[PDB]
Amino acid sequence: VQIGPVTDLHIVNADIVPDGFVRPAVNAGGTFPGPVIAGNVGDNFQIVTFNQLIECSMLVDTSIHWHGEFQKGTNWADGPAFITQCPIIVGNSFSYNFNVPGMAGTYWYHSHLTTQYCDGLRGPFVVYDPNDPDANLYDVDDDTTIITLADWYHVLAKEMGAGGAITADSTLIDGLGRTHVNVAAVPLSVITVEVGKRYRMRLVSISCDPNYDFSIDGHDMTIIETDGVDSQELTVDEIQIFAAQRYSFVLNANQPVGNYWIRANPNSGGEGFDGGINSAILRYDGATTADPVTVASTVHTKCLIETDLHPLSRNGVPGNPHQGGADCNLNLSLGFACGNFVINGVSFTPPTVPVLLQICSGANTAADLLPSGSVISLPSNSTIEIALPAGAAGGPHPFHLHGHDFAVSESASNSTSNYDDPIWRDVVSIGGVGDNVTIRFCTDNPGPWFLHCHIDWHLDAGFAIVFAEDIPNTASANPVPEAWSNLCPSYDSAH
Amino acid sequence: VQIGPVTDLHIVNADIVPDGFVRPAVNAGGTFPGPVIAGNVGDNFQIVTFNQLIECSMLVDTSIHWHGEFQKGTNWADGPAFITQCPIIVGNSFSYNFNVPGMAGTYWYHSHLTTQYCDGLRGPFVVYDPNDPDANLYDVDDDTTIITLADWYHVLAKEMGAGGAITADSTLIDGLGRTHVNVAAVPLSVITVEVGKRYRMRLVSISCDPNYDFSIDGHDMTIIETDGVDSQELTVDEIQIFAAQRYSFVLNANQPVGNYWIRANPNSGGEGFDGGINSAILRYDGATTADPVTVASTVHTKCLIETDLHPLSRNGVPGNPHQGGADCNLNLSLGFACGNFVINGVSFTPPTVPVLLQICSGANTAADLLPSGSVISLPSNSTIEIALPAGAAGGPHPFHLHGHDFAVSESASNSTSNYDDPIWRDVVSIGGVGDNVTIRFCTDNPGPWFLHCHIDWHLDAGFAIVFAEDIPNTASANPVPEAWSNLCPSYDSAH
Amino acid sequence: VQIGPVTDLHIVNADIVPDGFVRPAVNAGGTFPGPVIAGNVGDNFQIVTFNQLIECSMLVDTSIHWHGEFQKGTNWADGPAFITQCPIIVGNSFSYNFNVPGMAGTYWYHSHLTTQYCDGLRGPFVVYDPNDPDANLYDVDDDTTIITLADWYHVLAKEMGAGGAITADSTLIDGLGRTHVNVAAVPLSVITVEVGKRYRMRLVSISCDPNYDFSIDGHDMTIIETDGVDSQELTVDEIQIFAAQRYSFVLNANQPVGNYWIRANPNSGGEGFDGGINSAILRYDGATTADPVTVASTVHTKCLIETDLHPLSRNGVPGNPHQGGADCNLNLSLGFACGNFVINGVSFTPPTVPVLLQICSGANTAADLLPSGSVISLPSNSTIEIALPAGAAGGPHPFHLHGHDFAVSESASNSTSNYDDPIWRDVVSIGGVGDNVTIRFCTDNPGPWFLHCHIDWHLDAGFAIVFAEDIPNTASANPVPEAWSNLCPSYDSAH
């Protein structure tokens, strides 16, 4: 079901049993996954978030991030607690009001307070484009062509465990899927197609942790979008999708009418598809309603490799075509030891005053911002290159940057850089020990933008810092509403 | 489950997944459908409604209607919000204390606040008859023979629609069914029978909108009751049942021990029975526990027609064996334009003071009453006749009158009136353009009686007017308890 | 999932549908059953119970008992409402803080307010012994090898009438099972085993009422533990387990790879296994994922007889070898009349002031303690014998004593006493008219200890007395935290 772009979104607690095991959840709009929030390019989004949360086992405060949306001019609507706002307290509401100029594709929203999105607050977010360059490549693009991949846990997020060393208890495709241990025969999701039709499947990883090896028996997948970035057509028979990433692929339903297994194997937890775990069903209209009996290819032949991807626009790459050919050029020491993650020797722990507020309240630099050693300023209007060399356990770590997308100049498991036509995206696997995954972008977006591993467990163990982009232009660039001013006083009073 | 006639009924929010899709709901008695409320003819019903609702997305006020109960002398207990009461606000309770003289059969209860009953607050209501004139036509008449047909939506009622055609997402029979799009193989309701026994099936439409074509593969159905009214035995192989109607039929379990599909095909929403949508299972004790493999008749051969129904008692018709032959005969103009329905040029919008309250406060005439043009007065001890010509989009509209049942002198799709032995009921389909459905009853029940289309979407869009019957005797006829008197000040103060 | 020995435990309302019928529940830790609370022998348990209950229909107060934990020194933490504490009110927490010296084995926890544990608040409690003498008898002992058996009702406990014979609507094994009437094909629990491994299976009855005949097609069970007491190895092929009892049994997975039914026939409610009621699935790794087609042995040849159990340690028996061979020997007259149970002519009805507070406020004798005639004082360091002659309306009644385990000197259906080597346990069936089931313990545990039938409906109808053990020393032995003292003032104020 789709909303808005002008919509109420209630946040409530409910018990759900997607794999047959009832446990409490945090829900956005009352469903798991949450409803699809949607509009067109350049629509004004006004999302009135009513916090009705009562079950403190999962926190009764909340804060919501719109994942992949630049929020230029509206950094205050971005969502990461203590980076851009204080949480909303229960009984209160907050209008997240923002535009999406110049963006279209497949995104998602989620809780961005501690590990709460694991406990259920996550759903798809799609910016349709009436003049979408890829539109003529399929027949159907609607709510029935969104595929969500979710890790699901029998253990309350607040009670793990971290880090960790945390594993899921099932994979849910479109909110349904079977339990890894003592698999009960619970309902599986169905995705229906009609012969001769072509489908823009919008694959959204709403994972708190694992990446999935995603494949559809008997069928190929032509990638056309990645993390909201339109791509040159690339046909693959399997896609490894890391936490928070999105792909749009054309499914051409050109196989005999019948039932085929939809497959999503995660890097951790249950291995295989016994009992129908890690599965959903692709069904042709007119097929017998039964489980598929198909098998995967013995060896997948055109597996997705990130260096095979290039933008549909001529995006090029900002800066100079050599290792470090950028203005401000960073290289981060990403580490782990004693149950905590570090970036440049510092584990992230949220400040009492949201970075955005510190800035709004007079901070000029840089050295003025809390937490010390967890904020890096970026000069206005500048090529930034970030190297994120791998090694820290574990891994592989999908890094994400708020308020931007970035050219992926060097991907995982391949030391050959690309300064011509690399894919731009917003979340990237930093690969394995030895790798030197590197990104470039331009600072056209004043404000504090979170940079973190997107494995939520590791974010909670402090794998993060803040790019405080153009500090001095941060207040003129982001006027805040009164209601945002009211957040931190309400929250501090409440706690 | 059965209660009362004396009972508590708590109204709460819960998420439920009747077709495998979790969403929020508004439940009476904590279950979907609500528990069966039951007692004997003549019983005093005492039903303490506790409002414990908190999810504002479906409204936290409520008001409950006991559909088909005449409510003589207890007009204040009727339930339609702003006609007979202000809603009960959350944290409060209200005793609906009323009696059922001279009524016995199959009824239901529902929220009668906005479209709240679509969100879950619907349940069967049954008045048993220790001397039921049909008791010897069956062996078993209990909670396991009640069959509810319900439309079910993935979109919250307050976010429809509207109007705006609106369509359901699954059919639920006894609270379970499978979704119309990307149907997941979720559990289906089973009804059990034993060879040689006869069952009073109490078929209840708790629908917000669609009518159903109901059938059981391999079985005939002998109708013995219509909307509370005992009928002569009419055997049919299909029953088209409109929103809010009820039928008791005898099922004779005379077939070979096995599994038989129960079928209920809505007039809008998913068509057919693929993957077991629009279906439940009739099982003989001793059958292999397996899905049925039966098929419906190619052509139904004794489909129910309303003119073939006749009261079991000689009821006759009030007034004159010709058209317009009543003390006080009305012909309503029923229209639709600009997303609203109108009755005699006026679209119903709820008053601020409930109609019963304005009467109790001095009001004397329809001119005196709010809403303006939305009230028609009726003189006491008269034969009313109401012609309800069809044609308004989008039929067919099931029109319902509170506080009464009526003789249907002219039915759908047939211009031949019947002033002899027409069936009496309380909810009648007005058919299609050209039809002139007409009803007669007698004014022996002072108070404000709602008259509306029972498609809830159409009622919220204005398809109603109020018959204020015997205004002058209303106050003395219906003494009100203090708790009713408190409802409006409490409600007004809350809002 | 496992939590503890130090943990939060939130008590919330949630609708659940374990047999496909949605209804309201009172949940501990958000699941049904509750999470397993675990620790090692000698550990300090600190369970913070957050009462977040809102649904009045099942009571918003609550109070938890740790069934079979002796609570020596901590009688205030025991949990029975109005015996050792007042209920925690909604919105408050309370810290159950206690140790388990000397004890190991399989226990459980539940609401001990009114009939609330029926409504969901139940879960297993395991004390692991790192030097368990039974360790070498098996390979696998963990959360996957706990098996709960639970009766489940469609009727909310508070509405059960009462008593009034009462019957469940399904049997749930590990929280899943099928309804007895109009059985829907809803998911069944699976217990997975690997060819050639031995399992410590922890069978726990969390029943409100029925006793189960428990068995596993094709397999033996070697009993090694009974209600916490290590036992000599006893191979049986069926186990009658009465409400609140526990057994650990070794299952040798020695049959061919396949699916085998696990059976739990309740002594009332649905009879047999038609459609998979009273059923769960034993699945071997490698078996096809399908319903077992196994059959129970026609006659079970080595079913559990309680007189066959002997302690593993040399517990022997206190006192002297003949009836009355104790310091303080009691014979309780157990009756039922007009819907209430009596113990020595008195029917238990909860006092306004909790028994332990009565003592703490300076009561010195049973005569001084309310309710009048519902208290029997015991002297310290004395051998107690309690005869519990059956005959009272159904029956068979499982009696349980708080703060103690006890030698079962005489078992049901067998009039021979055993004063050498009988099993010790904490819940015991008193059998049938004519029986004289007899227990013995020593009084080394100052405090008021509940003795009641563990059929909860029978407890609410009054089948209980309090053993006020060493009243003089009770206050000194049981120092209370301010929080406990805060309980009654809150409760009484709220009500």
Ligand SMILES: *[C@@H]1O[C@H](CO)[C@@H](O[C@@H]2O[C@H](CO)[C@@H](O)[C@H](O)[C@H]2NC(C)=O)[C@H](O)[C@H]1NC(C)=O
């Ligand atoms: C049209 O409605 C009329 C009005 O009731 C129905 O008329 C009855 O039909 C049967 C046919 O023998 C007769 O027994 C009666 O004489 C008719 N009743 C009266 C009161 O005249 C007729 O059934 C309907 N037509 C159709 C085609 O269903």
Ligand SMILES: *[C@@H]1O[C@H](CO)[C@@H](O[C@@H]2O[C@H](CO)[C@@H](O)[C@H](O)[C@H]2NC(C)=O)[C@H](O)[C@H]1NC(C)=O
């Ligand atoms: C439907 O039937 C009603 C009868 O109650 C008709 O009523 C009258 O019909 C005469 C025509 O002979 C006209 O004077 C009016 O149009 C009607 N008014 C009254 C008060 O009788 C009505 O005409 C019929 N209408 C339709 C739409 O079929």
Ligand SMILES: *[C@@H]1O[C@H](CO)[C@@H](O[C@@H]2O[C@H](CO)[C@@H](O)[C@H](O)[C@H]2NC(C)=O)[C@H](O)[C@H]1NC(C)=O
């Ligand atoms: C069961 O056992 C008890 C004793 O353990 C029996 O109680 C005896 O009862 C008789 C008559 O009631 C008294 O004279 C004795 O004093 C009791 N003996 C003792 C030692 O107290 C009781 O009768 C038995 N009940 C049965 C068999 O129903």
Ligand SMILES: *[C@@H]1O[C@H](CO)[C@@H](O[C@@H]2O[C@H](CO)[C@@H](O)[C@H](O)[C@H]2NC(C)=O)[C@H](O)[C@H]1NC(C)=O
């Ligand atoms: C009834 O109870 C008695 C008491 O335990 C059981 O008698 C024991 O029987 C075993 C072997 O049959 C002997 O080793 C013991 O000497 C008996 N013990 C005592 C203490 O007498 C008896 O077996 C039980 N009856 C049944 C049918 O099981």
Ligand SMILES: *[C@@H]1O[C@H](CO)[C@@H](O)[C@H](O)[C@H]1NC(C)=O
């Ligand atoms: C990664 O590449 C960067 C280029 O900016 C280089 O400075 C650094 O030494 C490299 N580290 C590793 C581990 O390759």
Ligand SMILES: [Cu+2]
């Ligand atoms: Cu994100």
Ligand SMILES: [Cu+2]
């Ligand atoms: Cu983001």
Ligand SMILES: [Cu+2]
């Ligand atoms: Cu990481």
Ligand SMILES: [Cu+2]
């Ligand atoms: Cu983030």
Ligand SMILES: [Cu+2]
């Ligand atoms: Cu109605």
Ligand SMILES: [Cu+2]
């Ligand atoms: Cu009505």
Ligand SMILES: [Cu+2]
């Ligand atoms: Cu209508």
Ligand SMILES: [Cu+2]
């Ligand atoms: Cu109405």
Ligand SMILES: [Cu+2]
């Ligand atoms: Cu207990």
Ligand SMILES: [Cu+2]
């Ligand atoms: Cu106990």
Ligand SMILES: [Cu+2]
């Ligand atoms: Cu009992």
